[PDB]
């Protein structure tokens, strides 16, 4: 509530969001973005939640080309509840409002979508999102320069057996 945005689109579906505060601004961003990329975002949130194998089984890959189950194990490890909470608690009011606005506006588009620009309409993984989801996405991006590049290596890390 108290979420409002004015969106203009110029040639090529470029949005121009105007709002009176961070919450309205995020509202317009998430709504404009869902219109163009709802399914991409839903797919990447699934990955970032470690739910690939839940929806798609163990046989496929994420968009970063990791197997679904090693990818899920890595993201579940990365985006544990306590990591998300500490992360949220360190966000400034303005960033928080940005994020709550985004989630709300993304969700609003999902509520109205009839498939005009959304191909995955009806899939079970196309779902309402939450601020934690965007934190999951954020943390996934942060570690792309670090432990992300060792996701396979982390999953494979097991202690020795009896061998000689």
């Amino acid at each position: 509530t108290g979420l409002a945005a004015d969106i203009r689109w110029t040639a090529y579906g470029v949005p121009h969001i105007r709002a009176k505060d961070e919450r309205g601004l995020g509202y317009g961003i998430g709504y404009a973005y869902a219109r163009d990329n709802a399914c991409l975002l839903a797919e990447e949130i699934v990955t970032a939640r470690g739910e690939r194998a839940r929806y798609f089984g163990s046989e496929g890959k994420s968009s970063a080309e990791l197997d679904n189950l090693p990818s899920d194990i890595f993201y579940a490890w990365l985006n544990q509840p306590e990591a998300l909470q500490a992360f949220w608690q360190a966000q400034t009011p303005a960033v928080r409002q940005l994020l709550e606005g985004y989630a709300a506006g993304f969700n609003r588009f999902l509520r109205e979508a009839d498939g005009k620009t959304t191909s995955c309409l009806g899939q079970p993984w196309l779902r309402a999102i939450a601020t934690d989801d965007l934190l999951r996405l954020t943390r996934r991006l942060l570690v792309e320069g670090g432990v992300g590049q060792f996701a396979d290596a982390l999953v494979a890390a097991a202690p020795p057996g009896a061998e000689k």
Binding site: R8, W9, T10, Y12, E22, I29, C39, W77, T117, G148
Partner: protein, 546 residues
């Protein structure tokens, strides 16, 4: 990624100018999206952003444009652990046996039947972070293991950092805001402002070790292979704590390379070193920046920028749209001499023909010479001592150069390598006469659109990475969001494109409209002012609330 920022001393107008040409994937979690954000009176910025993020990552505002490129700094460190000789699940710190921690995660898996199984998986962790196993290089045996400490795990400042950059007025302000918050994860920042300043910062979140600790804390063999590896059995190899850093264990801003000039700064994913050769950036931690030989994109750009002629908007544009395969400048002259030397080797004739006919470009219309050149180069790079003039710390801009044809065994190896390259190309299903654009494409639904550019590793500033799919090369990353910004007095003038278009959804009116233009290399206005926006005959408008 490329970026050039031009200052008052080099632009044709005495003002700043920025060329943003970042290279990122065409799909997935880093697919750029364009947008313009405004809270009237206190925010007005336009550019591109990443999926899920309510901030602009690369863009401009009334007096500033900024952009990023992937830096060569370390953002994590490996730690080699000494295992307790009695227990490979315990590890030694200062000779004291420490227990590994276990965190289990549980994942649901959809089986053959459509039903869910629960898979439990143990993640082992040390004081540094989780253990990692790269078979054959980073093992976990009875004597050692490796843990990884990623500095961006504790960077909670990333979104506030970009939000703050979105509110920056000019270069000095942008620098202040970045140096205070130190929330940039793992990119360089380059920027220009109206006043005509041009800025380069290697200002990101980098693990800090005091300079005297390095020689003894490094794992020397792993460090020669490019890995930031430290000795994990000694507490004095923990990251150093300095109260000036914005986060415990990261390098303070005063220790990260910055260069503020009025002529130019540039970066193509090399280190800070040759950002502008008239002022080398030297003397940094090896975690930060090292004076290593620059790749062909940087060499190319430096070949265009150095000198004293002034740089026009159009000049920066063409550096991208030329599709010039700069690596050819190093090897094709001699390679062609070798061709002439061997006229009437039945095996080499299609190759040499193709290569003499080639425009040295990765244009849609560029001939098969690019294909022959690429595979030649892949084998050339695996040869020892074949450069006429090897890399030379003293001539970093013009070395290496030429084939050592004068040395008889190199000549045999270069010849064999061109025969192998030719055989690989000829073996594959290339129709005779076919162009680079007939091969490299991006699939849109059931159509295909020819895409210009080529791999950055061959010096094509318009870097396009592709992979084999069926009969074609399918584009997967490179040139993505393009913005070229100047500052007329009326307001920021920006031009560019999003290569792959706004929407990844095939149903969208904006699934391929800009891809079509990218194919034709027809950049467009990026409308920023209310006047420019209202001028657009496609303009549409929705207001929403809840």
């Amino acid at each position: 990624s490329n970026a050039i920022a031009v200052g008052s001393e080099r632009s044709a107008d005495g003002k700043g100018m920025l060329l943003a040409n970042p290279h990122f994937p065409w799909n997935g979690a880093m697919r750029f999206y364009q947008m313009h954000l405004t809270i009237p009176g206190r925010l007005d910025v336009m550019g591109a952003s990443l999926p899920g993020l309510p901030v602009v990552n690369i863009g401009f505002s009334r007096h500033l444009a900024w952009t990023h490129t992937v830096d060569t700094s370390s953002h994590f460190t490996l730690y080699r652990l000494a295992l307790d000789p009695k227990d490979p699940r315990r590890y030694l710190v200062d000779g004291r046996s420490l227990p590994l921690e276990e965190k289990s995660v549980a994942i649901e898996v959809r089986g053959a039947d459509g039903k869910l199984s629960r898979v439990e998986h143990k993640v082992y962790q040390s004081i540094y972070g989780p253990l990692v196993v790269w078979p054959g290089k980073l093992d976990w045996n009875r004597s050692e293991a490796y843990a990884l400490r990623d500095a961006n795990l504790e960077n909670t400042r990333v979104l506030q950092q970009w939000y703050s950059i979105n509110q920056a007025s000019d270069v000095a302000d942008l620098r202040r805001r970045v140096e205070a918050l130190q929330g940039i994860p793992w990119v360089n920042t380059l920027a220009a402002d109206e006043q005509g300043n041009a800025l380069y910062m290697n200002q990101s979140v980098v693990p800090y070790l005091k300079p005297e600790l390095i020689p003894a804390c490094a794992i020397p063999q792993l460090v020669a292979e490019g890995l930031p590896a430290l000795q994990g059995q000694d507490s004095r190899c923990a990251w150093s704590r300095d109260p000036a850093a914005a986060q415990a264990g990261i390098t303070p801003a005063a220790q990260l390379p910055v260069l503020l000039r009025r002529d130019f700064v540039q970066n193509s994913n090399d280190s800070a070193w040759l950002t502008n050769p008239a002022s080398p950036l030297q003397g940094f931690s090896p975690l930060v920046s090292q004076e290593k030989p620059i790749g062909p994109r940087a060499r190319y750009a430096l070949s265009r920028l150095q000198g004293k002629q002034p740089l026009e908007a159009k000049t920066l544009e063409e550096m991208v749209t030329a599709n010039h395969v700069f690596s050819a400048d190093q090897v094709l002259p001699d390679l062609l001499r070798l061709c002439r030397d061997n006229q009437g080797e039945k095996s080499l004739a299609r190759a040499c023909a193709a290569l003499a006919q080639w425009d040295r470009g990765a244009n849609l219309d560029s001939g098969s010479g690019f294909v022959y050149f690429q595979r030649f180069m892949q084998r050339f790079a695996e040869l020892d001592g074949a450069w006429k003039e090897p890399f030379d710390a003293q001539r970093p801009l013009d070395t290496p150069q030429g084939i050592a044809l004068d040395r008889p065994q190199v000549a045999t190896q270069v010849r064999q390598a061109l025969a192998d390259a030719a055989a690989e190309v000829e073996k594959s299903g290339i129709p005779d006469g076919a162009r680079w654009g007939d091969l490299q494409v991006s699939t849109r639904g059931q159509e295909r659109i020819a895409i210009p550019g080529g791999d950055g590793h061959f010096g094509v500033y318009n870097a396009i990475q592709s992979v084999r799919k069926g009969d074609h090369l399918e584009v997967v990353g490179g040139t993505s969001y393009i913005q070229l910004v100047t500052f007329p007095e009326e307001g920021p003038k920006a031009r560019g494109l999003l290569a792959f278009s706004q929407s990844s959804d095939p149903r969208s009116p904006h699934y391929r409209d800009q891809t079509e233009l990218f194919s034709r290399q027809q950049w467009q206005t990026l409308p920023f002012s209310d006047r420019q926006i209202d001028a657009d005959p496609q303009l549409q408008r929705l207001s929403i609330r809840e």
